[PDB]
Design an enzyme around this catalytic site. Structure first.
Site, mmCIF file in Angstrom:
data_model
loop_
_atom_site.group_PDB
_atom_site.id
_atom_site.type_symbol
_atom_site.label_atom_id
_atom_site.label_comp_id
_atom_site.label_asym_id
_atom_site.label_seq_id
_atom_site.Cartn_x
_atom_site.Cartn_y
_atom_site.Cartn_z
ATOM 1 N N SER A 15 21.548 -9.101 -24.084
ATOM 2 C CA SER A 15 21.537 -10.437 -23.892
ATOM 3 C C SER A 15 22.413 -11.118 -22.928
ATOM 4 O O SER A 15 22.223 -10.983 -21.712
ATOM 5 C CB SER A 15 20.706 -11.181 -24.580
ATOM 6 N N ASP B 209 9.873 -10.870 -26.598
ATOM 7 C CA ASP B 209 11.236 -11.253 -26.913
ATOM 8 C C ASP B 209 11.325 -12.777 -26.914
ATOM 9 O O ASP B 209 11.085 -13.413 -25.891
ATOM 10 C CB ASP B 209 12.209 -10.652 -25.898
ATOM 11 C CG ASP B 209 13.666 -10.805 -26.300
ATOM 12 O OD1 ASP B 209 14.017 -11.804 -26.981
ATOM 13 O OD2 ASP B 209 14.470 -9.920 -25.926
ATOM 14 N N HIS C 205 14.289 -9.212 -30.159
ATOM 15 C CA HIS C 205 15.252 -9.389 -29.090
ATOM 16 C C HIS C 205 16.113 -8.141 -29.002
ATOM 17 O O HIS C 205 16.895 -7.857 -29.917
ATOM 18 C CB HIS C 205 16.097 -10.636 -29.339
ATOM 19 C CG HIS C 205 17.178 -10.850 -28.330
ATOM 20 N ND1 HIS C 205 16.919 -11.020 -26.987
ATOM 21 C CD2 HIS C 205 18.522 -10.923 -28.466
ATOM 22 C CE1 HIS C 205 18.059 -11.193 -26.341
ATOM 23 N NE2 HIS C 205 19.046 -11.136 -27.215
#
Length: 463
Positions: free
Chosen positions: A171, A406, A433
């Site tokens: 991320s 995602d 995710h």
């Protein structure tokens, strides 16, 4: 760094001093916390990971990653986590809200976007900023940004005795990655970037693609649940959004949007509207959590809210004693310096108009014509980075892992980052995710081969 054992492995811990301000090389100093799990075999180097957020602890993430690490990786690499400047065990740690400040926000439904509602939110925002400055001072806040974590990362590389960095970022850790790639391309041995941030995106359009991602994940969650006996969203997935709202809307007083009517919980808080939305969002990060979303929605049918509340507590990082870790405060302070804030009211108002249409599951009532500015519009220290395409011509081939549905980091942002980096794009078909080192043997095989032999996945690789 002098290592010492820890407070669950063969783990070693230590701190590393870095300067708060890299232009005042011996002014104020920060201490970064690090955790190291020694390699069991022939050691290539250290695998440094970052879990993202920002504000999330790399130390805690290494402890989780340790359990799901493939045997060959654990053989060849020291697994290493660190807490970025301002985060978790690093000192000084960003603190703004007391535990009671956080609970008080979470009790509010937060759906009133009349002028009075907006004014109330913006007042809460100003007081938050005031508290950050009072506890941290402007100097440290000025320098918690990613551009300076990349510099710390190079100091960590050296402190660990590695010539070149081997890095896995999830991320937001992806933004750390591409920033390190630009400032130290000749120190990158290998880099895996899972669940990508495109550093060139417009702030508002990225947020709307993110709203779309969560709405699509919601659709996927609801279609799946619709095949199951007793689905709390009903058997017709085209009516799931409406049914969802029939369940969460009564958590708000229908005549006065500022009044919460929380669902009964065993916890004294009960479940506010805003916590119901947050708990839903938390669940949509992974199908692993869909059973919990289904339980929490079944509870709402009976005007109960315990599972949705525990889901929102997971997201906010509130433990069973009512204490928050600092991830929430740190996330904001870091995001506010990573790019220019949106300060134009009309853009923020139009962002809200579109988001209500793109993600109605997240939206209460009707467009009001007003919307609040984000916390970052009120930040007292300036952005230390700005949107741009990543340019790092001399960089070794890298791997960007991107999941097709995602919600938090949409597929296309991974594609765009892979383009800019001119590295390989590895696709995972799924609605979650991130995915690396989380069960999937095919993904983990590509990633292992790349980490050890430097071998990249072929063009169009899927899993």
């Amino acid at each position: 760094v002098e290592w010492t054992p820890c407070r669950p492995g063969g783990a070693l811990c230590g701190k590393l001093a870095v300067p708060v301000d890299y232009d005042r090389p011996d002014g104020d100093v920060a201490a970064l916390a690090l955790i190291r799990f020694p390699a069991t075999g022939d050691k290539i180097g250290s695998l440094v990971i970052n879990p993202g957020g920002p504000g999330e602890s790399g130390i805690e993430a290494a402890l989780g990653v340790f359990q799901t690490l493939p045997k060959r990786v654990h053989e060849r690499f020291d697994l290493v986590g660190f807490d970025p400047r301002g985060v978790a065990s690093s000192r000084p740690a960003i603190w703004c809200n007391s535990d009671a400040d956080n609970d008080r926000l979470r009790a509010e439904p937060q759906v009133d976007y009349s002028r009075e509602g907006v004014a109330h939110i913006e007042n809460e925002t100003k007081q938050f900023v005031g508290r950050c400055v009072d506890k941290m001072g402007k100097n440290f806040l000025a320098h918690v940004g990613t551009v300076n974590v990349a510099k710390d990362l190079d100091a960590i590389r050296a402190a660990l005795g590695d010539d070149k960095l081997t890095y896995l970022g999830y991320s937001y850790g992806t933004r750390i990655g591409s920033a390190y790639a630009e400032e130290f391309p000749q120190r990158v041995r290998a880099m895996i970037l899972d669940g990508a941030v495109d550093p060139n995106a417009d702030p508002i359009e990225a947020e709307l693609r993110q709203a779309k991602g969560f709405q699509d994940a919601f659709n996927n969650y609801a279609a799946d649940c619709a095949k199951n006996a007793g689905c709390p969203l009903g058997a017709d997935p085209a009516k799931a959004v409406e049914v969802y709202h029939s369940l969460v809307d009564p958590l708000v007083d229908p005549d006065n949007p500022r009044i919460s009517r929380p669902a009964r919980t065993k916890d004294p808080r009960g479940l506010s509207y805003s916590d119901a939305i947050v708990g839903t969002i938390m669940a949509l990060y992974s199908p692993n959590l869909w059973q919990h979303l289904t339980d929490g929605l079944s509870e709402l049918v009976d005007n109960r809210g315990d599972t949705l509340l525990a889901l929102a507590d997971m997201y906010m990082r509130r433990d069973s004693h009512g204490r928050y870790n600092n991830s929430g405060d740190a996330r904001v302070a870091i995001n506010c310096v990573d790019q220019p804030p949106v300060t134009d009211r009309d853009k923020v108002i139009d962002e809200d108009r579109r988001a209500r249409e793109i993600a109605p599951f997240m939206s209460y009532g009707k467009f009001t014509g007003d919307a609040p500015l984000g916390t970052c519009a009120f930040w007292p220290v300036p952005p230390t980075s700005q949107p741009h395409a990543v340019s790092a011509p001399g960089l070794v081939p890298t791997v960007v892992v991107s999941t097709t549905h995602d919600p938090a980091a949409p597929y296309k942002a991974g594609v765009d980052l892979a383009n800019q980096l001119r590295g390989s794009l590895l696709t995972f078909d799924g609605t979650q995710h991130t995915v690396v080192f989380q069960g999937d043997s095919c993904i983990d095989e590509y990633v292992t081969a790349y980490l050890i032999g430097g071998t990249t996945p072929p063009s169009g690789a899927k899993c």
